[PDB]
C-alpha cells in the first residue's frame, strides 16, 4: 500500500486471515492495536518494508503487513 518512508500507520486490529501464533509474535515486537509505527526504509523493488515501533525496529513483507488492519494516521495535527 505504498509504504513511503516516514509515513505513519496506526494498527487498528488484525485481519481475519492472521493466525493467533503469528499475531502473538508481532504483538511481542510492539505492533499493538492503538499503537503507531513509522516506515524507516523500503527495499529496492519495494519489498520487504523496514519499520520502527515503540519497542524495536523490524522488517516484514507487504504480504505480512496485509495481515494487519492499518490506517494512515491522516490527522492534520498528528501529520505535522
PDB file of C-alpha atoms in Angstrom:
ATOM      1  CA  UNK A   1       0.000   0.000   0.000  1.00  0.00           C
ATOM      2  CA  UNK A   2       2.869   2.406  -0.895  1.00  0.00           C
ATOM      3  CA  UNK A   3       4.801   2.407   2.395  1.00  0.00           C
ATOM      4  CA  UNK A   4       6.572   5.734   1.792  1.00  0.00           C
ATOM      5  CA  UNK A   5       9.470   6.457   4.228  1.00  0.00           C
ATOM      6  CA  UNK A   6       8.266   8.482   7.288  1.00  0.00           C
ATOM      7  CA  UNK A   7       4.588   7.586   6.628  1.00  0.00           C
ATOM      8  CA  UNK A   8       2.986   6.656   9.960  1.00  0.00           C
ATOM      9  CA  UNK A   9       0.371   3.920  10.368  1.00  0.00           C
ATOM     10  CA  UNK A  10      -1.874   3.102  13.311  1.00  0.00           C
ATOM     11  CA  UNK A  11      -2.584  -0.574  13.989  1.00  0.00           C
ATOM     12  CA  UNK A  12      -6.386  -0.843  14.417  1.00  0.00           C
ATOM     13  CA  UNK A  13      -6.593  -4.644  14.532  1.00  0.00           C
ATOM     14  CA  UNK A  14      -5.518  -7.749  12.625  1.00  0.00           C
ATOM     15  CA  UNK A  15      -7.007  -9.386   9.510  1.00  0.00           C
ATOM     16  CA  UNK A  16      -9.356 -12.392   9.806  1.00  0.00           C
ATOM     17  CA  UNK A  17      -6.514 -14.127   7.912  1.00  0.00           C
ATOM     18  CA  UNK A  18      -3.715 -13.897  10.563  1.00  0.00           C
ATOM     19  CA  UNK A  19      -3.117 -16.956  12.749  1.00  0.00           C
ATOM     20  CA  UNK A  20      -3.032 -16.381  16.549  1.00  0.00           C
ATOM     21  CA  UNK A  21       0.586 -17.666  16.609  1.00  0.00           C
ATOM     22  CA  UNK A  22       1.906 -15.054  14.123  1.00  0.00           C
ATOM     23  CA  UNK A  23      -0.232 -12.353  15.817  1.00  0.00           C
ATOM     24  CA  UNK A  24       1.479 -13.133  19.192  1.00  0.00           C
ATOM     25  CA  UNK A  25       4.922 -12.778  17.553  1.00  0.00           C
ATOM     26  CA  UNK A  26       4.111  -9.331  16.110  1.00  0.00           C
ATOM     27  CA  UNK A  27       2.481  -8.226  19.400  1.00  0.00           C
ATOM     28  CA  UNK A  28       5.691  -9.107  21.313  1.00  0.00           C
ATOM     29  CA  UNK A  29       7.564  -6.787  18.874  1.00  0.00           C
ATOM     30  CA  UNK A  30       5.365  -3.737  19.692  1.00  0.00           C
ATOM     31  CA  UNK A  31       2.754  -3.989  16.893  1.00  0.00           C
ATOM     32  CA  UNK A  32      -0.142  -3.301  19.324  1.00  0.00           C
ATOM     33  CA  UNK A  33      -3.613  -2.167  18.134  1.00  0.00           C
ATOM     34  CA  UNK A  34      -3.901   1.533  19.062  1.00  0.00           C
ATOM     35  CA  UNK A  35      -0.122   1.947  18.610  1.00  0.00           C
ATOM     36  CA  UNK A  36       1.600   3.615  15.596  1.00  0.00           C
ATOM     37  CA  UNK A  37       4.710   2.690  13.605  1.00  0.00           C
ATOM     38  CA  UNK A  38       6.852   4.673  11.152  1.00  0.00           C
ATOM     39  CA  UNK A  39       8.225   3.374   7.846  1.00  0.00           C
ATOM     40  CA  UNK A  40      12.022   3.779   8.084  1.00  0.00           C
ATOM     41  CA  UNK A  41      13.083   2.476   4.653  1.00  0.00           C
ATOM     42  CA  UNK A  42      11.929   0.193   1.816  1.00  0.00           C
ATOM     43  CA  UNK A  43      13.853  -2.386  -0.243  1.00  0.00           C
ATOM     44  CA  UNK A  44      14.719  -1.616  -3.879  1.00  0.00           C
ATOM     45  CA  UNK A  45      11.848  -3.446  -5.730  1.00  0.00           C
ATOM     46  CA  UNK A  46       9.507  -2.275  -2.910  1.00  0.00           C
ATOM     47  CA  UNK A  47       9.573  -5.367  -0.641  1.00  0.00           C
ATOM     48  CA  UNK A  48      10.328  -6.040   2.172  1.00  0.00           C
ATOM     49  CA  UNK A  49       9.466  -2.994   4.366  1.00  0.00           C
ATOM     50  CA  UNK A  50      11.603  -1.747   7.278  1.00  0.00           C
ATOM     51  CA  UNK A  51       9.674  -0.056  10.172  1.00  0.00           C
ATOM     52  CA  UNK A  52      10.068   1.080  13.791  1.00  0.00           C
ATOM     53  CA  UNK A  53       7.723   0.659  16.814  1.00  0.00           C
ATOM     54  CA  UNK A  54       7.891   1.958  20.416  1.00  0.00           C
ATOM     55  CA  UNK A  55       9.731  -1.273  21.315  1.00  0.00           C
ATOM     56  CA  UNK A  56      12.012  -2.132  18.360  1.00  0.00           C
ATOM     57  CA  UNK A  57      12.742  -1.898  14.639  1.00  0.00           C
ATOM     58  CA  UNK A  58      11.590  -4.840  12.451  1.00  0.00           C
ATOM     59  CA  UNK A  59      11.269  -5.969   8.812  1.00  0.00           C
ATOM     60  CA  UNK A  60       8.435  -7.779   7.125  1.00  0.00           C
ATOM     61  CA  UNK A  61       6.976  -8.197   3.652  1.00  0.00           C
ATOM     62  CA  UNK A  62       3.944  -6.316   2.298  1.00  0.00           C
ATOM     63  CA  UNK A  63       2.156  -9.693   2.350  1.00  0.00           C
ATOM     64  CA  UNK A  64       2.905  -9.792   6.154  1.00  0.00           C
ATOM     65  CA  UNK A  65       1.617  -6.198   6.590  1.00  0.00           C
ATOM     66  CA  UNK A  66      -1.594  -7.220   4.736  1.00  0.00           C
ATOM     67  CA  UNK A  67      -2.460  -9.474   7.785  1.00  0.00           C
ATOM     68  CA  UNK A  68      -2.742  -6.300   9.945  1.00  0.00           C
ATOM     69  CA  UNK A  69      -5.534  -3.698   9.750  1.00  0.00           C
ATOM     70  CA  UNK A  70      -3.603  -0.446   9.303  1.00  0.00           C
ATOM     71  CA  UNK A  71      -4.925   3.039   8.828  1.00  0.00           C
ATOM     72  CA  UNK A  72      -2.966   6.039   7.680  1.00  0.00           C
ATOM     73  CA  UNK A  73      -2.559   8.470  10.548  1.00  0.00           C
ATOM     74  CA  UNK A  74      -4.170  11.259   8.498  1.00  0.00           C
ATOM     75  CA  UNK A  75      -4.892  13.607  11.422  1.00  0.00           C
ATOM     76  CA  UNK A  76      -3.570  17.050  10.494  1.00  0.00           C
ATOM     77  CA  UNK A  77      -2.256  17.958  13.985  1.00  0.00           C
ATOM     78  CA  UNK A  78      -0.560  14.495  14.071  1.00  0.00           C
ATOM     79  CA  UNK A  79       0.809  14.608  10.468  1.00  0.00           C
ATOM     80  CA  UNK A  80       2.812  17.792  11.273  1.00  0.00           C
TER      81      UNK A  80
END
